[PDB]
Design a protein around this ligand. Sequence first.
Ligand SMILES: COc1ccccc1CCN1C[C@@H](C(N)=O)CCC1=O
Ligand SMILES: [Zn+2]
Length: 140
Amino acid sequence: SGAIYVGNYRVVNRHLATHNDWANLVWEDSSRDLLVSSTTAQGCDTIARCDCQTGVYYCSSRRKHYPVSFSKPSLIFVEASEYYPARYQSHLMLAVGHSEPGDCGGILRCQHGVVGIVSTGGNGLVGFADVRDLLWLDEE
Ligand SMILES: COc1ccccc1CCN1C[C@@H](C(N)=O)CCC1=O
Ligand SMILES: [Zn+2]
């Protein structure tokens, strides 16, 4: 589990969105595994606006933050899970790192701010849904 709290937005994995998230929906995209809802309180996270390919992510299944090198956001085939059939997920970045399904939501960050959240993984891989292109997260 986990979310990004930037401005009056809450960014979560779409497959982990709550009823409250759907009832306060701002934007969702199944192909990216992302959903954004509105919040009453202001958040403290800031979004990275950069082209970093190194950063640090939080792994809840180890209670640890790990440094990683990750690929550029791309269209990758993701195996069937409890929440989606086997399909292509867009804006996904892969790295070598430990992950288990419940690690979804953990933040990946770089020196500039939040880069994305854990969304896929398996067998010593971890995949992150990028948010750096969602410029509207920084305003209104
Ligand atoms: C960190 O994720 C791991 C790690 C190990 C093994 C599997 C996963 C996640 C598998 N999966 C894919 C998600 C997606 N973005 O399509 C949907 C929900 C889900 O359970
Ligand atoms: Zn950066």
